[PDB]
Design a binder for this molecule. Structure first.
Ligand SMILES: Cc1cc2nc3c(=O)[nH]c(=O)nc-3n(C[C@H](O)[C@H](O)[C@H](O)COP(=O)(O)O)c2cc1C
Ligand code: SF4
Ligand code: SF4
Ligand code: SF4
Ligand code: FES
Ligand code: FES
Ligand code: NA
Lengths: 430, 214, 263, 87, 43
């Protein structure tokens, strides 16, 4: 099929997204969670790892690697070390709020996917690293983790299966980089959130030096349903190799900014116009949209008139789905002063470990501040462009990558605005 | 702004008295049992956060005490406390007002929310009111972008503000009342204000759509 | 009988499994640029000066950490490798201070010398520089930390060779600073060796400061008698006068270190 | 860290007295061979040159750095002392 | 069937030690942690 949208309310995984119905154990049961789990655990890992493979699920954290293949690196005989699952609730990228709702309104789907996903990987426990600012969501999660322990759903002999499993909530201390998979692993270890190099890959040397898998909240929180409702059912949504539903955040200059769940590959215009109520001042007032959090390049109105919302449609437009966080800007915005803020954010978030992001991201920040003020020369635009190509691809982790793409996106599509401010500054101060 | 070198002063030195209360020692014993034996060093963050929650900031004596309890080099605790922004190494007010200014909030007049808090409290970002009651600073995306603008006071979120609304929260705090966490525009969470557009039907109960043969 | 075969610019090398790209190039005689890596410290991998192109791969691997895989062609001098070095050297120097005339490293600075061999000849950095306040860590090692390139060699040496876990990094991002946070003296019978392993003038010798330049000095390869270990040393002299004692490498005795008494 | 001054063999002469010039304090010498430094490609070429010239020589064997086992992944060992406590 | 109010309100009463008290109750249900085999890497 070629249409994608108006997802039926029967096919929505996060049936309690808005927190209207009860989130505690007595309610998550009435909505299907923890149902026939003992049947799922006894089916083995090769069946669960076959469900994730078939569904074409790709990690929702922001890199989009196939979830089934990735979780199979931990499907190996043990060498005497414990195996661990680390759910990434760091929720750090600007524009994205999806993971917040799962931990606050549907925590029993997150605890269940930790068991289901952990069983597939042969893990003994799950560490749920949540960002330190989400103190109330963490408490919700701890209250639900207690209830699933009291009822026997996790812990010793979970769901009467034979498997023993633990769920630990570890609270972060306020750093966007600890959401990086290997920085996260180091933070759980009592160190600074500095990412590691690869290899070794966490599937060999991970948390505490043990084999580890890091999964996003939204990635794990849908593993139980995919096992319950089948691989093919989740493959029925979205284009080939872009399967499933998705949590879309729409923010910025929309009428009704909101978090909604929608099918994958829905056209960006439909996503804004239906669920968000449209751009402020009309669609024609649209200037540019960041299709997935501040890391991804922006795109102008022309490319937003037909582009879909999935990992491949947005890659032909020179951007990415990222976290599927949609930030909209209308003509009254100061586009250059808005991207220059993303650089201040990446400049303020860089761990400082490796040279290109240490100096480059800060250096790009200093330059972008002058473009905003207008105090530069049109020959610096190609200089800044190049300085970004020396950050991208040379850093330990992908933050320097994500700090370079926004600058590339602005230069690609909004150069005349950069070169028209610089005129007004020269004349004004001649 | 802030400095990552500590110089002793009469009100912050290795002899400023800090100790864990006996009911915050039973809590530490439970933090340290979350990690494999031999890797107790993984407990530095929660325990170093525990000291802050019991004192509101981290004197150099507090940090030297987490080190003694967990048996790590003190420098390894100094690295942690200086790395993460939530550890207050300089004393702060009773209420720590954090205003988000990253792009999603900036597009919704987060400056106005900031401009208002400056005049109402009579301070500037980074300062602390002479009452030692309020501390105002900007921050980065606090994860509630769809409900911008928003502030965090201590451990709560006050979303969807309008310059009028934040003023209300600064008086309930002066009056000693608790200003009720949550949005401020009628809607309760992240749903689209103006009625729902999704999840209208009642949820679909247990056993729905379950594949055959399971 | 497990020596895999790798290629360095085409020439084939039989290396043990576990050898890195950087050690593979040692054997064909090619030395990779570096700052953070040191053969006697744990691998760190943050300076990114060793980025090297592997044929048919798009990204560049860190030569000092990437384990080598059989059938690889390491292109130590391709365009990607040369451009990674130029870009990286360009960042290292962006916030570095114009200190070479007043710096005790000048004339024997890995940052000066690798900027001449692998970096560019221009500056396109038109901003202000950072400046970090100095730390007083004892009477032997002078710190002028604006010259630090945050390579963490001092941190790894102190931790793993001296066993003195007192140097570390505080702060974060471009504000990240090496040191001790508090005011501690880095006193140890092996502490003077940070002067050698620090690749720049951030950590230099107080007793030796300002007294000579490297090109001036004559090197006499002698032995140390302050103890019975017989550490191999080098004695720099200038115009009939002893300037400083340095370690001479001897694997079976002192490796590359000497006690502070010797130094 | 460069190793490019460690490839060739050198021939140097024993140090002789230097003293201070009475007028200026410069370093005076009566040794004509104090700044003589011959370069050779092989240990054998350097010995032959000294032999045919009658200089008594003294040879020291090349000190190469022994090959070492590196491993970034060793910094995170589940149970070995090589687990570093800081990056 | 309600779905017209907000049924996540318990967080209006969490205090400064909530997360750390639940973690203390949960300590009875945990399983014996694995042991590397040494007290620490010996800092
Ligand atoms: C700077 C940075 C921040 C990241 N933050 C997050 C995050 O807050 N949540 C997340 O699920 N992934 C985040 N990621 C991506 C993770 O590294 C990784 O892709 C993800 O945890 C893998 O889990 P997945 O299978 O669901 O994709 C981040 C990456 C970078 C470079
Ligand atoms: S790219 Fe930035 S955040 Fe990532 S490791 Fe390097 S310095 Fe740290
Ligand atoms: S360390 Fe000293 S000599 Fe080397 S580049 Fe810096 S200022 Fe110049
Ligand atoms: S002081 Fe020297 S050795 Fe230490 S991190 Fe800085 S440049 Fe490297
Ligand atoms: S940008 Fe302010 S909460 Fe995300
Ligand atoms: S020498 Fe390899 S990154 Fe520094
Ligand atoms: Na030095």
């Amino acid at each position: 099929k070629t249409s994608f949208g108006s997802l039926k309310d029967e096919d929505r995984i996060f049936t309690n997204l808005y927190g209207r119905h009860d989130w505690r154990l007595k309610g998550a049961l009435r909505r299907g969670d923890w149902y026939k789990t003992k049947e799922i655990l006894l089916k083995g890992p090769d069946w669960i790892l076959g469900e994730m493979k078939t569904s074409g699920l790709r990690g929702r954290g922001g890199a989009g690697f196939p979830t089934g293949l990735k979780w199979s690196f931990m499907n190996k005989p043990s060498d005497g070390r414990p195996k661990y699952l680390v759910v990434n609730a760091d929720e750090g990228e600007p524009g994205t709020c999806k993971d917040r709702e799962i931990m606050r309104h549907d925590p029993h789907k997150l605890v269940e996917g930790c068991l289901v996903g952990g069983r597939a990987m042969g893990a003994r426990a799950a560490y749920i690293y949540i960002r330190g600012e989400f103190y109330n969501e963490a408490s919700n999660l701890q209250v639900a983790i207690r209830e699933a322990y009291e009822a026997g759903l996790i812990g010793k002999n979970a769901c009467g299966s034979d498997y023993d499993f633990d769920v630990f909530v570890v609270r972060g201390a306020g750093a966007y980089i600890c959401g990086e998979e290997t920085a996260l692993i180091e933070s759980i270890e009592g160190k600074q959130g500095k990412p590691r190099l690869k290899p070794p890959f966490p599937a060999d040397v991970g948390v505490f030096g043990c084999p580890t898998t890091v999964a996003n909240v939204e990635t794990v929180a849908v593993s139980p349903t995919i096992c319950r409702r089948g691989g093919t059912w989740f493959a029925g949504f979205g284009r080939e190799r872009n399967s499933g539903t998705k949590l879309f955040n729409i923010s910025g200059h929309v009428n009704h900014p909101c978090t909604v769940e929608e099918e994958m590959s829905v056209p960006l215009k439909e996503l804004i116009e239906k669920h968000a109520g449209g751009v402020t001042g009309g669609w024609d007032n649209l200037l540019a949209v960041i299709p997935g959090g501040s890391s991804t390049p922006l795109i102008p109105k022309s490319v937003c008139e037909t582009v879909l919302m999935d990992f491949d449609a947005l890659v032909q437009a020179q951007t990415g789905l990222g976290t599927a966080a949609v930030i909209v800007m209308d003509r009254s915005t100061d586009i250059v002063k808005a991207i220059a803020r993303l650089i201040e954010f990446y400049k303020h978030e860089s761990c400082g470990q490796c040279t290109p992001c240490r100096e480059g991201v800060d250096w790009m920040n200093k330059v972008m501040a002058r473009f905003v003020k207008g105090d530069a020369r049109p020959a610096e635009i190609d200089s800044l462009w190049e300085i970004s190509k020396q950050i991208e691809g040379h850093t330990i982790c992908a933050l320097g990558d994500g700090a370079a793409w926004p600058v590339q996106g602005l230069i690609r599509h909004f150069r005349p605005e950069l070169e028209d401010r610089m005129q007004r500054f020269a004349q004004q101060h001649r | 702004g802030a400095l990552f070198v500590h110089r002793d002063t009469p009100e912050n030195n290795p002899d400023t008295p800090f100790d864990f209360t006996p009911e915050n020692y039973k809590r530490i014993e439970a933090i340290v049992k979350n990690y494999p034996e031999g890797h107790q060093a993984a407990a530095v963050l929660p325990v170093l956060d525990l000291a802050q929650r019991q004192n509101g900031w981290l004197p150099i004596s507090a940090m030297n005490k987490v080190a003694e309890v967990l048996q790590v080099p003190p420098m390894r605790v100094y690295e942690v406390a200086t790395f993460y922004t939530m550890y207050n190494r300089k004393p702060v007010g009773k209420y720590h007002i954090q205003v988000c200014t990253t792009t999603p909030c900036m597009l919704r007049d987060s400056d106005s929310i900031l401009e208002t808090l400056q005049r109402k409290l009579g301070i500037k970002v980074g300062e602390t009111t002479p009452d030692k009651l309020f501390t105002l600073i900007e921050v980065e995306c606090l994860g509630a972008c769809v409900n911008a603008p928003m502030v965090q006071i201590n451990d709560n979120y006050y979303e969807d503000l309008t310059p009028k609304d934040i003023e209300e929260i600064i008086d309930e705090l002066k009056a000693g009342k608790v200003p009720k966490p949550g949005p401020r525009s009628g809607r309760f969470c992240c749903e689209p204000a103006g009625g729902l557009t999704s999840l209208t039907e009642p949820p679909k109960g247990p056993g729905f759509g379950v594949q055959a043969g399971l | 009988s497990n020596l895999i075969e790798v290629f360095v610019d085409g020439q084939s090398v039989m290396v043990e499994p576990g050898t890195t790209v950087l050690q593979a190039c040692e054997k064909v005689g090619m030395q990779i640029p570096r700052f953070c890596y040191h053969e006697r410290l744990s691998v760190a991998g943050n300076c990114r000066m060793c980025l090297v192109e592997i044929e048919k791969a798009p990204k560049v691997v860190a030569a000092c950490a990437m384990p080598v895989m059989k059938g690889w062609n390491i292109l130590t001098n391709s365009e990607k490798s040369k451009k990674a070095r130029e870009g990286v050297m360009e960042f290292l120097l962006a916030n570095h201070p114009l200190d070479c005339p007043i710096c005790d490293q000048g004339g024997e600075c890995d940052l000066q010398d690798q900027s001449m061999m692998f970096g560019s000849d221009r500056s396109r950095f038109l901003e202000g520089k950072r400046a970090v306040e100095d730390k007083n860590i004892g009477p032997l090692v002078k710190t002028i930390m604006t010259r630090c390139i945050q390579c963490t060699r001092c941190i790894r040496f102190a931790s793993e060779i001296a066993g003195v876990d007192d140097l570390g990094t505080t702060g974060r991002g471009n504000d990240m600073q090496v040191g001790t946070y508090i005011e501690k003296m880095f006193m140890s019978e092996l502490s003077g060796n940070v002067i050698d392993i620090c690749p720049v003038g951030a950590l230099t010798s107080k007793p030796y400061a300002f007294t000579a330049r490297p090109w001036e000095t004559r090197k006499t390869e002698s032995i140390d008698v302050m103890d019975a270990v017989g550490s191999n040393i080098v004695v720099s002299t200038r115009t009939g006068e002893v300037m400083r004692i340095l370690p001479r490498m001897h694997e079976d005795i002192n490796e590359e270190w000497i006690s502070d008494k010797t130094r | 860290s460069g190793v490019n001054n460690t490839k060739k063999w050198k021939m140097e002469f024993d140090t002789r007295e230097r003293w201070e010039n009475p007028l200026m304090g410069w370093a005076s010498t009566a040794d004509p061979l104090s700044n003589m430094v011959l370069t050779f490609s092989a240990k054998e070429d350097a010995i032959a040159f000294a032999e045919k010239n009658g200089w008594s020589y003294d040879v020291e064997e090349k000190k190469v750095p022994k090959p070492k086992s590196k491993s970034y992944g060793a910094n995170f060992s589940w149970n070995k002392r090589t687990r570093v406590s800081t990056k | 069937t309600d779905t017209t109010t907000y049924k996540n309100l318990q967080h209006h009463d969490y205090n400064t030690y909530t997360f750390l008290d639940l973690n203390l109750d949960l300590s009875k249900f945990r399983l014996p942690q694995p042991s590397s085999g040494r007290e620490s890497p010996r800092h």
